[PDB]
Design a protein around this ligand. Structure first.
Ligand code: HEM
Ligand SMILES: C[C@@H]1[C@@H](O)[C@@H](C)C[C@H](C)C(=O)[C@H](C)[C@@H](O)[C@@H](C)[C@@H](C)OC(=O)[C@H](C)[C@H]1O
Ligand SMILES: C[C@@H]1O[C@@H](O)[C@H](O)[C@H](O)[C@H]1O
Ligand code: NA
Length: 396
């Protein structure tokens, strides 16, 4: 056809396809064909344009549920998904659980979360060096935190992890395989929610069960799906981002030594690595203009779809200086690693807390930590909408 395939290439590690800098400079809004649905989408590569697609009510995610709309992933979007809701319906859906995820409430978790880290790092010191940081820290830490927050049984880890990996599929699985898991995950979350019917609990699944027996704006579908979205995101983002930040730290070891030297740098370093790291391997959930909307180089017509690349917006040279370098001493870091606008990540403060406390703990107690398996052999996850390591053997 006329228009280039997107994604532009099979990803390697955390590397960014070089065409994104080319486009930011010469063609910052460009037509692409996504791997699923029909027609073309505008790919948005710059920060200013990304804030408009993500930030403006003239862009609808609900409109992108149509099986014909371009998308990054095999199945048409679940219409009951938060991501697929427009305000004000979306605002009402987010209030269901927003209370738990305000920065004040998430800060209240820091002591429990720091305990959970320390304990898991004891178990890793017991085993002895070398060990797999995935098995010992990256998987168990976020999984325990989201299980205790939602009230999901921790022994269900293998079950919900298998479900979440399938649903984060890009090319790994087929539409039918994914569609099947969506059905099972919904029927599973439905069951946990129903156990609260004559046994309410002090946790988020508890709040979802109350909204089911008493609410009128929100369907049972929308409420349970919120449980699915929180359990997937709540472990998958963090499990992958711990390995991504540890990868970035140990492959240029001075990064790691610079936090060993000043542990109090860890928060700014987390923000900078959030900027730098393509957690979302390519593209985004799609937005469809409901009216003509002016971007930097082009006016998108009502009914035309747009996709953002978050990591490309976060490499924008008009916003960050030496944008292609990791710098923990940056004075200004207005990244959209957590998106922007109405769908801005609800868990952003939990993700921040988990990355701070994982890395602070490692940097303090394990000043000798190195990668103890070769770079060339690193097992990057393939065929998923997000990036991370299956294993990260380390020594201290
Ligand atoms: C480093 C950790 C994380 C990163 C980098 C991340 C990134 C993102 C981004 C970029 C979005 C916006 C997608 C868009 O509008 O197209 C998002 C949305 C979301 N994230 Fe996060 N996330 C992280 C952690 C978490 C955590 C811990 C949770 C839940 C506990 C979570 C739950 C969600 C949910 C439910 C949405 C959809 C929100 C909505 O549509 O209103 N995320 N995340
Ligand atoms: C399965 C996820 C869903 O759980 C969301 C809420 C979790 C995460 C944290 C997201 O919101 C995530 C950033 C997604 O928007 C993208 C990876 C997108 C391309 O993938 C998606 O849109 C996929 C298909 C979503 O449905
Ligand atoms: C189609 C898309 O992909 C599946 O992983 C997830 O079930 C997500 O919830 C859905 O909207
Ligand atoms: Na989409």
């Amino acid at each position: 056809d006329a228009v280039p395939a997107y994604p532009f290439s099979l990803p390697h590690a955390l590397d960014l396809d070089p065409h994104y800098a080319e486009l930011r400079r010469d063609e910052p809004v460009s037509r692409v064909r996504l791997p699923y649905g029909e027609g073309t989408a505008w790919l948005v590569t710059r920060m200013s344009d990304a804030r408009i697609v993500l930030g403006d009510s003239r862009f609808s995610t609900a409109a992108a549920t149509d099986p014909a709309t371009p998308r990054m992933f095999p199945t048409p979007p679940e219409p009951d998904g938060v991501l697929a809701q427009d305000p004000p319906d979306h605002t009402r859906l987010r209030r269901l659980v927003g209370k738990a995820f305000t920065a004040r409430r998430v800060e209240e978790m820091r002591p429990r979360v720091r305990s959970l880290v320390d304990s898991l790092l004891d178990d890793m010191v017991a085993h002895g060096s070398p060990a797999d940081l995935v098995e010992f820290l990256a998987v168990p830490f976020p999984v325990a935190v989201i299980c205790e927050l939602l009230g999901v049984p921790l022994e269900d880890r293998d079950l919900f992890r298998t479900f979440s990996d399938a649903m984060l599929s890009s090319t790994r699985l087929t539409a039918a395989e994914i569609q099947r898991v969506q059905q099972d995950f919904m029927v599973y979350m439905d069951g946990l929610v129903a156990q609260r019917r004559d046994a309410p609990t002090e946790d988020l699944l508890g709040a979802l069960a109350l909204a089911t027996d008493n609410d009128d704006h929100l369907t049972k579908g929308e409420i349970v799906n919120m449980g699915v979205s929180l359990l997937i995101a709540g472990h998958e983002t963090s499990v992958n981002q711990i390995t991504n930040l540890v990868h970035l730290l140990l492959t240029e070891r001075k990064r790691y030594e610079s936090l060993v030297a000043d542990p109090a740098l860890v928060p700014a370093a987390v923000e900078e690595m959030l900027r730098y790291t393509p957690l979302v391997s390519a593209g985004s959930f799609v937005r469809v203009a409901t009216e003509d909307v002016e971007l930097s180089t082009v006016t998108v017509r009502a009914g035309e779809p747009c996709v953002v690349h978050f990591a490309s917006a976060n490499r924008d040279e008009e916003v960050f200086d030496h944008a292609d370098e990791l710098d923990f001493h940056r004075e200004r870091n207005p990244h959209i690693a957590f998106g922007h606008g109405a769908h801005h990540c609800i868990g952003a403060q939990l993700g921040r807390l988990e990355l701070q406390e994982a890395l602070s703990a490692l940097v303090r107690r394990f000043p000798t930590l190195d990668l103890a398996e070769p770079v060339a052999g690193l097992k990057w996850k393939q065929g998923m909408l997000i990036r991370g390591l299956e294993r990260q053997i380390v020594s201290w």
